[PDB]
Design a protein around this ligand. Structure first.
Ligand SMILES: *[C@@H]1O[C@H](CO)[C@@H](O[C@@H]2O[C@H](CO)[C@@H](O[C@@H]3O[C@H](CO)[C@@H](O)[C@H](O[C@H]4O[C@H](CO)[C@@H](O)[C@H](O)[C@@H]4O[C@H]4O[C@H](CO)[C@@H](O)[C@H](O)[C@@H]4O)[C@@H]3O)[C@H](O)[C@H]2NC(C)=O)[C@H](O)[C@H]1NC(C)=O
Ligand SMILES: *[C@@H]1O[C@H](CO)[C@@H](O[C@@H]2O[C@H](CO)[C@@H](O[C@@H]3O[C@H](CO)[C@@H](O)[C@H](O[C@H]4O[C@H](CO)[C@@H](O)[C@H](O)[C@@H]4O)[C@@H]3O)[C@H](O)[C@H]2NC(C)=O)[C@H](O)[C@H]1NC(C)=O
Ligand SMILES: C=CC1=C(C)/C(=C/c2[nH]c(/C=C3N=C(/C=C4\NC(=O)C(C)=C4C=C)C(C)=C\3CCC(=O)O)c(CCC(=O)O)c2C)NC1=O
Ligand SMILES: *[C@@H]1O[C@H](CO)[C@@H](O[C@@H]2O[C@H](CO)[C@@H](O)[C@H](O)[C@H]2NC(C)=O)[C@H](O)[C@H]1NC(C)=O
Ligand SMILES: *[C@@H]1O[C@H](CO)[C@@H](O)[C@H](O)[C@H]1NC(C)=O
Ligand SMILES: *[C@@H]1O[C@H](CO)[C@@H](O)[C@H](O)[C@H]1NC(C)=O
Ligand SMILES: *[C@@H]1O[C@H](CO)[C@@H](O)[C@H](O)[C@H]1NC(C)=O
Ligand SMILES: *[C@@H]1O[C@H](CO)[C@@H](O)[C@H](O)[C@H]1NC(C)=O
Ligand SMILES: *[C@@H]1O[C@H](CO)[C@@H](O)[C@H](O)[C@H]1NC(C)=O
Ligand SMILES: *[C@@H]1O[C@H](CO)[C@@H](O)[C@H](O)[C@H]1NC(C)=O
Ligand SMILES: *[C@@H]1O[C@H](CO)[C@@H](O)[C@H](O)[C@H]1NC(C)=O
Ligand SMILES: *[C@@H]1O[C@H](CO)[C@@H](O)[C@H](O)[C@H]1NC(C)=O
Ligand SMILES: *[C@@H]1O[C@H](CO)[C@@H](O)[C@H](O)[C@H]1NC(C)=O
Ligand SMILES: *[C@@H]1O[C@H](CO)[C@@H](O)[C@H](O)[C@H]1NC(C)=O
Ligand SMILES: *[C@@H]1O[C@H](CO)[C@@H](O)[C@H](O)[C@H]1NC(C)=O
Lengths: 531, 50, 50, 100, 50
């Protein structure tokens, strides 16, 4: 709406303050009374560092001050502002903060609360201007397209600037999980000018906004002031930003369900003592405390030097797979199992069942030896390719062991092997079941009630192999399917096939989280002398 | 005899939590972590009793 | 209750109070037999009354 | 079958992801006779740098550069469109037919 | 009643089962079991009503 511009601004001074005991919120909605709860989550640690951003300006001698950088939104934010009058009005959430990616705004319009998640073309300095104590203009964005979410709440503030010593303190925390953005609110009246006030405060939830947004950056919208003229000047305000950390605290509830005080575990040995006994008052004596002063944050991963892509082309996009009674084995080794390259092909799997491992944890785990078995079945015989099944295929053609570790793949191929080369067979009429991972390529002529009929014209003697009647224009089932069975083996042997994880640099004498060929754990690494 | 009970499956796929947690997703993890937790808790109960 | 409270729990974590959805009043839930009951008898071969 | 907790594939990694410990129900039914005739509006996202979070989406149509970033033109080497079209048309096999 | 349940004779027919779910028993351990009384129910459904 015609965003104003600024020519010269002073460099931000990132002065750092201390937050005494602020930054605690209601972590759930369960109603409690007169109980002490030990909870784990993302909280602001006590006596942490807060970075301040000022906005004051004089008539001459100094340049304008507008500290609105792209603050990262890592795991959560603690936003505390100590303005007088009303200078800080809302925030901007997004990832790139341009019009090629969706971004959200939550700001006080002056006469309304505006929440929009659109493709915003933000100007260089988002602001809104007032003149003569009245809402003149809003200069946040220029264009907004391709969006659905829009909420407007009636509200009213006084835009007239004042003077004093920052009588107001308003604080919020923000976090987004599972597509919901959470906003908490608290307010109290203080009298400080250029320092963060001390004390203990609890934040109460006011919003739960359902937009699925990739939020990684953050920006603050401010206000400009004029002495009833075209030129605009800033006013005195300052806000503080803190980042949430994964840690444990102890919360105490009274009989009305409110939080009177909280203890941040792993701050000093006194809080750790209260954190284990689950009490605020401790009797005298000596107590055995548990471990809380440990924050393993660094991830170290070590994988071998295997770099070539693994041959998924000659095992999926091949020609003339054998029939089920004459299935073939393939040994796969010294490759990188990247399953994402199969997305580019035109074939889609209708069966992706895995047994010994989870399908999601296949890029992290690595195997000592893998094998592949491939054949062609009838289409409704695919459900017989599983541990402990019964049927024609599971008894006479291909049997899997019940202690199977691996995955089963299947996809319909009706346009490639239904027209020519239709020599697909399956074995009927066998004397006894088959063992796991075994085959019999034999064409002996089957006679019931004792073998060796030696002629097809006799009574009761039949061919063992029956042909699949594969032809186009048939239903689903009686249509050829290509099946690949992968068998995994996780041992103490050296690894041969390992998937796509980028290795990092080794670090020692630190409590870290390591990963050595799918051997994730927690501890310190020290040079050894073992053999 | 208490430190040697940590090498027991207790009906799980492995006696090591790292083998279970790295090979299975989070939903299938609790049904096999619970068996190890109950077995180790039972061992602690027995040790305290004697 | 709180304005958005619907049921109240106990420290043993079972519901002892509920708010009726039609008429906004608070009720109490208690078990329909709580407290012990003892039966004093002579021998069954001796007599029949208790 | 990719619309389920703890799944992998094109949809479950780049398009729509359900969180673990999901509470609810999922519905599906075949609609081949209503949207297969000159629709040309159904797409899915290939070629993303990184997986998607649960209950999140990204509507962006920037050019994808393999092993790098900030591609300029479609004729530049190793540059592809991110969105690929469902080829919905009548008289195709089950498994290529649209489902709501 | 009074018969030998040989499921292998169904392989010779031209009809293939798209559903063979079993409840309370295993499909592999049906040649070794010996039942007291069995019943059969048959009808025709829509195909996605299965
Ligand atoms: C590895 O390979 C070897 C050989 O390559 C496999 O060994 C074969 O195993 C099968 C079965 O295990 C075996 O078949 C039997 O052969 C007998 C001859 O030795 C036949 O006589 C028998 O059929 C009838 O005879 C039995 C006794 O009378 C009956 O109990 C049986 O049910 C059959 O009887 C029928 O007819 C009567 C008539 O009244 C009727 O009452 C019955 O009810 C029934 O209808 C079997 O067919 C082969 O002979 C073995 N081959 C050799 C060379 O010895 C081995 O199985 C393979 N291993 C694996 C794991 O697959
Ligand atoms: C939310 O949105 C942001 C931005 O829109 C997004 O950040 C992007 O993340 C991806 C992947 O995490 C980044 O893509 C990579 O960027 C690095 C440079 O940092 C490149 O080197 C990568 O290219 C290759 O790198 C290696 C070769 O050197 C290869 O081994 C590798 O496989 C790659 O082929 C790759 O392009 C991308 O740069 C950022 N974007 C920005 C602007 O930072 C974030 O992921 C989104 N959040 C979620 C949850 O999706
Ligand atoms: C844009 C976000 C925004 C939020 C999250 C917001 C919440 C919010 N503002 C309030 C008061 C208020 N809100 C403001 C002003 C602000 N306080 C702020 O959080 C901000 C950014 C301003 C901007 C000037 C003022 C002056 C009041 C006083 C209301 C009263 O008289 O009770 C209250 C308490 C009274 C109520 O529930 O209505 C809440 C919960 N208002 C907002 O404008
Ligand atoms: C989306 O953003 C682009 C670039 O960020 C905008 O393109 C610029 O628009 C301004 C109009 O003020 C022109 O002066 C520039 O020449 C344009 N190009 C560049 C490279 O800056 C575009 O207008 C935005 N809005 C849309 C596409 O609706
Ligand atoms: C004002 O901006 C110009 C151009 O960016 C710069 O050269 C000049 O030094 C600035 N003024 C001051 C006082 O820094
Ligand atoms: C926090 O601020 C102090 C000074 O205020 C500084 O010495 C310290 O390095 C900062 N960071 C941490 C992690 O304490
Ligand atoms: C925002 O405030 C302006 C006046 O400052 C008003 O004209 C406009 O309608 C408001 N926005 C909305 C969405 O009502
Ligand atoms: C963006 O907004 C301006 C008005 O400020 C308008 O003239 C222009 O057409 C808009 N851009 C688009 C692409 O509609
Ligand atoms: C986004 O906007 C463009 C035009 O600006 C339009 O062609 C496209 O269909 C829109 N996409 C969505 C998802 O709204
Ligand atoms: C708890 O609530 C009651 C009822 O509103 C109130 O009288 C009391 O002051 C509150 N606080 C405490 C500490 O009891
Ligand atoms: C193999 O890939 C080619 C293109 O690379 C494709 O035309 C052909 O249909 C594929 N064959 C299959 C999937 O059997
Ligand atoms: C994907 O397939 C296309 C043809 O369908 C091919 O040109 C391209 O090289 C393949 N790989 C990638 C990474 O796009
Ligand atoms: C619900 O409907 C009943 C039936 O008339 C009525 O008596 C009761 O007051 C209603 N409760 C409300 C409106 O909260
Ligand atoms: C009951 O007690 C009498 C006296 O000892 C005895 O004779 C009689 O057998 C008892 N009744 C039974 C059922 O044992
Ligand atoms: C199997 O079916 C054929 C007809 O398809 C029939 O002639 C034969 O008697 C049946 N039984 C055996 C044991 O082959």
């Amino acid at each position: 709406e015609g965003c104003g511009i600024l020519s010269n601004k002073s460099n931000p001074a990132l002065t750092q303050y201390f937050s005494s005991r602020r930054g605690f919120y209601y972590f759930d909605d369960t109603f409690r009374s007169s109980v002490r709860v030990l909870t784990t989550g993302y909280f602001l640690p006590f006596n942490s560092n807060l970075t301040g951003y000022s906005s004051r300006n004089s008539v001459t001698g100094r340049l304008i001050q507008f500290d609105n950088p792209n603050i990262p939104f890592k795991d959560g934010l603690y936003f505390a502002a100590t303005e007088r009058s009303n200078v800080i009005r809302g925030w901007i959430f997004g990832s790139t903060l341009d019009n090629t990616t969706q971004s959200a705004v939550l700001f006080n319009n002056g006469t309304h609360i505006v929440i929009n998640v659109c493709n915003f073309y933000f100007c260089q300095d988002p602001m809104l201007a007032v003149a003569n104590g009245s809402h003149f203009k809003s200069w946040v964005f220029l264009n907004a397209t391709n969006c659905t979410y829009n909420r407007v709440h009636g509200f009213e503030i006084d835009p007239s600037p004042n003077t004093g010593s920052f009588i107001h303190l308003r604080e919020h925390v923000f976090r987004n999980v599972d597509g919901f953005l959470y906003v908490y609110h608290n307010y109290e009246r203080v009298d400080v000018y250029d320092n963060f006030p001390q004390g203990f405060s609890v934040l109460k939830p006011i919003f739960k906004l359902p937009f699925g947004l990739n939020i990684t950056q953050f920006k603050v919208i401010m206000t400009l002031f004029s002495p009833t003229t075209s030129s605009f000047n800033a006013d005195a305000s300052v806000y503080f930003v803190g980042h949430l950390k994964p840690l444990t605290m102890l919360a105490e509830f009274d009989e009305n369900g409110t939080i009177t005080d909280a203890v941040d575990c792993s701050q000093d040995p006194l809080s750790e003592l209260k954190c284990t006994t689950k009490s605020l008052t401790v009797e005298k004596g000596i107590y055995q405390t548990s471990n809380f002063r440990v924050s393993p944050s660094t991830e170290v991963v070590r994988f071998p030097n295997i770099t070539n892509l693994c041959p998924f082309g000659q095992v999926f996009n091949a020609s003339n797979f054998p029939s089920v009674y004459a299935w073939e084995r393939l040994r796969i080794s010294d490759c990188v199992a990247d399953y994402a390259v199969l997305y580019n092909s035109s074939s889609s799997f209708s069966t992706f069942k895995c047994y010994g491992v989870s399908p999601t944890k296949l890029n992290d785990l690595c195997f000592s030896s893998v094998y592949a078995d491939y054949f062609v079945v009838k289409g409704d015989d695919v459900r017989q390719i599983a541990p402990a099944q019964t049927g024609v295929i599971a008894d006479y053609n291909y049997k899997l062991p019940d202690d199977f570790t691996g995955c089963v793949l299947a996809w319909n191929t009706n346009s490639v092997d239904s027209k020519s080369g239709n020599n697909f067979y399956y074995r009927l009429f066998r004397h006894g079941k088959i063992k796991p991972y075994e085959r019999d390529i034999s064409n002996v002529l089957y006679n019931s009630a004792g073998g060796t009929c030696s002629s097809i014209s006799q009574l009761g003697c039949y061919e063992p192999l029956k042909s699949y009647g594969f032809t186009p224009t048939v239903g689903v089932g009686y249509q050829p399917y290509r099946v690949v069975v992968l068998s995994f083996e996780l041992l103490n042997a050296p690894a041969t096939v390992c998937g796509p994880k980028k290795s990092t640099e080794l670090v020692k004498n630190k409590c870290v989280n390591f990963n050595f060929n799918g051997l994730t754990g927690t501890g310190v690494l020290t040079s050894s002398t073992k053999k | 005899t208490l430190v040697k009970q940590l090498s027991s499956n207790f009906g799980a796929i492995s006696s090591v939590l790292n083998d279970i947690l790295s090979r299975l997703d989070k939903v299938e993890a609790e049904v096999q972590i619970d068996r190890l937790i109950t077995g180790r808790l039972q061992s602690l109960q027995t040790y305290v009793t004697q | 209750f709180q304005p958005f409270q619907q049921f109240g729990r106990d420290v043993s974590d079972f519901t002892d109070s509920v708010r009726d959805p039609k008429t906004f009043e608070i009720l109490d839930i208690s078990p329909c037999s709580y407290g012990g009951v003892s039966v004093i008898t002579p021998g069954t071969n001796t007599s029949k009354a208790v």
